[PDB]
């Protein structure tokens, strides 16, 4: 049962930096994992950032992203930068276990980030 877990609520930094830990529970043990962070704004979903990483290696956002991340085993600690008040909202942690089979999709219940300054 691919289940994803993330905090209920997080305050952004004064400099618009919010971090949250999201780690998953895997029936197997997978080596190639893809993490995506989504914003759920009522009706729509938007892709905040993604990254693929190998089990044991460095989490690396070769995007260019506003996301940096560190990976401890079954865990990711994500940090999002450049947030502004209009960015307050619910952020879904999406994890794909991709290798070895079988494929697993886990979608978290969401993290509410409040950006005020």
């Amino acid at each position, epitope marked *: *049962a*691919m*289940h*994803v877990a993330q905090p209920a609520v997080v305050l952004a930094s004064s400099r618009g930096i919010a971090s949250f830990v999201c780690e998953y529970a895997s029936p197997g043990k997978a080596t*190639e994992v*893809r993490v*995506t962070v*989504l914003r759920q704004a009522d*009706s729509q*979903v938007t*892709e905040v950032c993604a990254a693929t990483y190998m089990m044991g290696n460095e989490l690396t956002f070769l995007d260019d992203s506003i996301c940096t991340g560190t990976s401890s085993g079954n865990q990711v600690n994500l940090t999002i930068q450049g947030l502004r008040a209009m960015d307050t909202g619910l952020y*879904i942690c*999406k994890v794909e276990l*991709m*290798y070895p*089979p*079988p*494929y*697993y*999709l*886990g*979608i978290g219940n969401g993290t509410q980030i409040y950006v005020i300054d």
Partner: antibody, heavy 118, light 109 residues
């Protein structure tokens, strides 16, 4: 407007190959995973194959493992299904479908008919 | 492979009635990573419900999803003529993606 338009359907003799193509318009193809799903005449849906974003992760149904190949040209915004060693039971409407960012198959092509028969 | 068993095979109801469709899973399903598709003859399937209970865009309110674990139910609160069609449930959280065999909702006369 999201749109998937499939082509390549036709008749094939058993043991041979056929390649379906699915042409995607209306969204940034490279941010979504894609599937093929078939429906034999008179029956329900059967998931055929899955391909990740960059194309470097592919999964197949047991009924076609070792015979079919899925692939994508992100530059041409096109999805392909390479079918080999075709059997009669592979005869179906073959749908191309897009994975929603939250998991389900939210947009579907129109389906193309593939008849495998001597 | 998570096998989805839909029931009944056919629903014989008259327009305006409430239709209740069921989908049971061979094992526990994801976290309600279950979806419902509609299909009329000669058309592709179209997503109705995802995440067990959330409506796809443009899907009217009469369609509603409930359930959890291994027991899921799609409800149509009042059947309009366009709702008579085939309905598939689908587990999409783990490979292989699997579908139920479908319930057909036909006009009782």
């Amino acid at each position: 407007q999201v749109q998937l338009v499939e082509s390549g359907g036709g008749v094939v003799q058993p043991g041979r190959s056929l390649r379906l193509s699915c042409a995607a318009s209306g969204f940034t193809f490279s941010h979504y995973t894609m599937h093929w799903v078939r429906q034999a005449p008179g029956k329900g849906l059967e998931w055929v194959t899955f391909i990740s974003y960059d194309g470097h992760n592919k999964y197949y149904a047991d009924s076609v493992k070792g015979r079919f190949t899925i692939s994508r040209d992100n530059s041409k915004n096109t999805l392909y299904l390479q079918m080999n060693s075709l059997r009669a039971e592979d005869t179906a409407i073959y749908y191309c479908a897009r994975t929603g960012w939250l998991g389900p198959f939210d947009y579907w092509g129109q389906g193309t008919l593939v008849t495998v028969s001597s | 492979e998570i096998v989805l068993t839909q029931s009944p095979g056919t629903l014989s109801l008259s327009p305006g009635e409430r239709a209740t469709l069921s989908c049971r899973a061979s094992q526990e399903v994801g976290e309600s990573e279950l979806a419902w598709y509609q299909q009329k003859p000669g058309q592709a399937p179209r997503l109705l419900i995802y995440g067990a209970f959330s409506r796809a865009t443009g899907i009217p309110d009469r369609f509603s999803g409930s359930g959890s674990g291994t027991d899921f139910t799609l409800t149509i609160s009042r059947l309009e003529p366009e709702d008579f069609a085939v309905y598939y449930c689908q587990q999409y959280g783990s490979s292989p993606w699997t579908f139920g065999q479908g319930t057909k909702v036909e006009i009782k006369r």
